[PDB]
């Protein structure tokens, strides 16, 4: 697996450092010299290049990468022309960071395999946490079912609450001072909690 | 619950639209007139103001909001001075979007209740998906346990494999009691 | 002792010249090449560096200085990030030139040992002289 | 008495606030609109004007002030032409904020009654404190 | 004799070409690289330097010139600090190109031996020709 990350910003630079940490060959490309110097130690290869130029793109041997990530999300012209070149160069997987809804529509027309909205996805997740302070993190399995990680419940056993049949929801795990429990069989004392169930049913448990 | 979102960018604008959709009173503040006009329909109140000025901050009645979100993540001076003013104004919860590690350190000194790295958090999650194409989405319960949503497994019963399987998705149908929960090392084995 | 003065302006350059005149080892740091050349003869060591970068800060042996004076008073971002790095490097004394009241509050949060208002302090003394002349 | 402060910076603004606090009639002049609005409440009269223009200077009744303080210390051209106009208008006392040694010499030639170095004077006091701490 | 012309504009460059044509040693100084290259062949010595810096002025051997012509007529700060430095280095004759009436007064205070108004003087001759044509 050889990965190319084009554009070293907050999003693109984070991908380079994480992939390099996992032990992958990463080519970091950016048009700004200061960015490339900073990430020269966090990538296998770091090049100062303009990704909108076909000659510079071919000078990098970009055809040797299965995955190319275009992490340019504030320059629509630079973002769309880069992915147009990569599609012309027959890159199998092209993942692009989109700016707005109109940028997303263009990238879908010119063939971006995956389109990413980092700030928009995080903003929705943060806004869910703001609305319900109990909700610490959640993953949306579907449009009606989700897994949500959450003093009345304190000193209460699992068998004490019958939300297993009352709400049709299952308690996946409970965190006890840095200790996790898998398949918690009642009864277990709840101290001052991961649950999977229907989205409406989960809200019922938070109420009671 | 009254929420104030300061700075209407990709991150701040997303919070305003989502909170407004859920039916909450949102005050959208931005120094750019074009941004405020765009989000005037996605907020209860939209104001063109400089959040680094105390007089403009008081003109908004910012003390009436329990939650203020400072979504300025490319202007460190504007971000840190805004949160310094809000802390001086005794706002209970101040959530700030940080730019880098040094910006994160400053905001922790001047008392930001929660510090958010939107692009950095997404970049780590995207990089996990790049490394393993099977991994579609995941939530890290701990540093050793996580829930990961994922042709050899095709036409194979659950009892056929003796490897907990939380749920399986069947053409838009979910079953309760491929989503698996287990140890991080053990998940890689599967 | 050894003094490091970061930012060679009217206030920072005046500290270097006075300390160097008194016979002290002074390290002069400025991001502007022209400033460093001017103060090369007025400092024991003059370096062109960006104080907001940790690697450049460590290249100067900044840990060897008991006193570091941050004399950037118009760039709040450069001033606050410099003293944040110096606080991390466990510098005993950090004296910073503040721009306004809000800059003073930020520096007090991030551990500036002493905060200086050169123009504001002089402006009060001049105003006192004007009133009672 | 009546004081006119031209240039609302860190040094000029500090003079206006201190004099206004003591209960004196202060005219605040600055070419920047944002500065004048900020100091509108801290001065008896705050005007947006260019002090290098004689017509704008006469529009303010600058002849009515015994003391005029020119607090422009980074623009040598604006500082020296202002005090040249004030000297022509026969202002009794003109106090000017100098930038460097050469600016001090020019102002002394064109009749600045008193020349002030805020950052340089504070930098010597700070350096004395550092040496004997 | 030896002439130094500082500032290669329409007026300064015309002096260099005419003096060099007459067979005189002319030192051409300009802060702009493009101007110096253009007048490299029209001067005995052409240097890219900032005339407001004393060290750069001494690097040129400016004390060896009896006549120095300061031909900066749109930058009052650069024009007045140059002739202030030249007056300090004891240049016998300093001829300066003035911008307006106020610039003329400043240069007369800081010891400009002769002050020239090229456009103003030509504008009067042209106006005389227009009236009586
Ligand atoms: N043509 C180009 N080729 C390569 N890199 C480029 C090009 N144009 C811009 N970049 C770089 O891509 C990076 C990301 O672009 P930019 O900063 O505009 O986007 P962004 O959406 O604000 O980023 P992020 O949110 O990830 O910080 C920057 O470092 C920029 O210098
Ligand atoms: N002082 C300020 N007061 C209010 N709003 C401000 C201020 N400074 C900037 N903003 C606004 O905040 C928003 C976000 O700022 P900016 O674009 O610098 O951050 P960002 O990290 O690039 O944002 P995002 O990634 O969410 O798009 C912009 O709409 C900008 O106009
Ligand atoms: N990141 C930096 N690292 C080092 N020096 C810097 C940095 N940023 C600015 N400087 C220098 O610090 C000096 C002082 O900064 P600045 O001119 O902005 O402040 P000031 O308040 O106007 O200062 P002064 O009143 O002392 O003249 C300048 O010479 C500037 O070039
Ligand atoms: N021609 C002018 N007329 C009036 N005010 C002016 C003029 N030129 C500049 N000023 C103002 O004078 C003030 C001080 O000038 P400047 O910022 O250049 O000096 P400084 O040495 O940095 O000052 P300080 O150290 O007091 O902050 C500024 O608010 C500036 O807008
Ligand atoms: N500090 C300086 N040292 C040397 N040369 C300088 C300096 N500042 C400006 N000059 C040069 O002096 C020349 C004349 O200056 P400028 O163009 O501002 O005046 P001017 O009145 O428009 O002149 P002219 O009418 O002769 O064209 C220019 O070539 C300019 O680059
Ligand atoms: Na962003
Ligand atoms: Na100053
Ligand atoms: Na001309």
């Amino acid at each position: 697996k050889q990965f190319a990350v084009i554009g070293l910003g907050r999003f693109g630079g984070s991908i380079c450092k994480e992939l390099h940490r996992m032990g992958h060959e990463v080519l970091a490309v950016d048009i700004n010299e200061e960015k490339v110097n900073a990430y020269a130690s966090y990538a296998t290869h770091a090049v100062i290049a303009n990704a909108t130029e076909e000659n510079e793109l071919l000078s990098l041997g970009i055809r040797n990468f299965e995955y190319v990530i275009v992490a340019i999300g504030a320059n629509i012209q630079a973002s769309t022309l880069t992915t147009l070149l990569l599609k012309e160069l027959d890159i199998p997987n092209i993942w692009v960071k989109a700016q707005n809804y109109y940028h997303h529509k263009v990238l879908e027309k010119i063939g971006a395999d995956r389109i990413i909205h980092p700030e928009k996805d995080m903003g929705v997740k943060i806004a869910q946490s703001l609305s319900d302070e109990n909700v610490l993190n959640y993953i949306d399995l579907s449009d009606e079912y989700s897994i949500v990680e959450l003093r009345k419940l304190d000193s209460k056993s699992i068998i004490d609450l019958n939300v297993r049949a009352k709400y049709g929801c299952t308690i996946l795990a409970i965190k006890h001072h840095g200790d996790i429990c898998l398949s918690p069989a009642p009864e277990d004392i709840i101290r001052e909690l991961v649950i999977m169930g229907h989205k409406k049913d989960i809200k019922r448990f938070e109420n009671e």
Side-chain angles (χ1 to χ4, degrees), chain A:
Chain A
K1 284 179 173 297
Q2 300 181 29
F3 307 93
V5 179
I6 294 179
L8 299 171
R10 293 164 289 187
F11 178 72
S14 178
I15 299 180
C16 277
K17 296 179 60 177
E18 182 66 22
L19 284 175
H20 184 259
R21 184 193 63 82
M22 302 181 72
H24 293 276
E25 292 179 337
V26 183
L27 171 64
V29 187
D30 198 304
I31 207 176
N32 179 264
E33 178 175 4
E34 184 175 0
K35 291 290 185 58
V36 177
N37 295 8
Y39 287 94
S41 302
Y42 295 103
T44 299
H45 194 190
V47 188
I48 313 172
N50 189 339
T52 55
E53 305 294 333
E54 181 176 0
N55 54 316
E56 305 193 28
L57 214 58
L58 290 179
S59 303
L60 309 183
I62 204 70
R63 289 197 184 95
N64 301 120
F65 301 94
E66 295 187 9
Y67 291 84
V68 181
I69 301 91
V70 185
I72 309 172
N75 196 342
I76 293 185
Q77 184 176 339
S79 176
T80 59
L81 285 167
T82 304
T83 74
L84 184 83
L85 292 176
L86 300 169
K87 195 66 177 179
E88 184 184 8
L89 268 36
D90 298 328
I91 303 301
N93 306 97
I94 306 168
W95 295 20
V96 196
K97 169 187 170 73
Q99 176 179 335
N100 52 69
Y101 167 79
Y102 296 141
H103 191 195
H104 178 106
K105 281 302 179 183
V106 175
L107 298 169
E108 214 169 4
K109 294 298 187 61
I110 65 187
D113 295 297
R114 185 171 175 179
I115 305 175
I116 310 153
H117 295 264
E119 303 87 354
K120 183 189 276 74
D121 287 3
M122 284 295 297
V124 172
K125 182 174 300 179
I126 292 300
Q128 296 297 332
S129 182
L130 290 165
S131 177
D132 200 325
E133 67 283 356
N134 299 327
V135 180
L136 298 180
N137 190 15
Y138 74 99
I139 168 181
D140 291 330
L141 306 183
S142 62
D143 297 334
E144 295 181 353
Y145 295 81
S146 178
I147 298 177
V148 180
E149 174 186 354
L150 301 182
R151 65 179 180 271
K152 58 177 59 179
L153 303 179
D154 190 9
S155 299
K156 300 301 181 179
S157 300
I158 299 186
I159 204 63
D160 194 7
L161 47 96
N162 54 271
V163 309
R164 166 139 297 189
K166 177 186 180 184
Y167 297 144
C169 302
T170 64
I171 301 176
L172 265 36
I174 305 99
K175 202 61 179 179
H176 305 267
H177 190 65
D179 302 333
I180 193 65
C181 301
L182 277 65
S183 178
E187 91 295 335
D188 293 317
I189 302 180
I190 295 181
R191 309 181 66 86
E192 190 72 25
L193 182 62
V194 183
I195 55 179
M196 174 181 59
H198 191 271
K199 179 175 58 182
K200 300 175 76 281
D201 300 1
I202 291 179
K203 298 298 179 182
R204 302 173 188 172
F205 179 81
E206 293 163 336
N207 301 337
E208 297 83 33

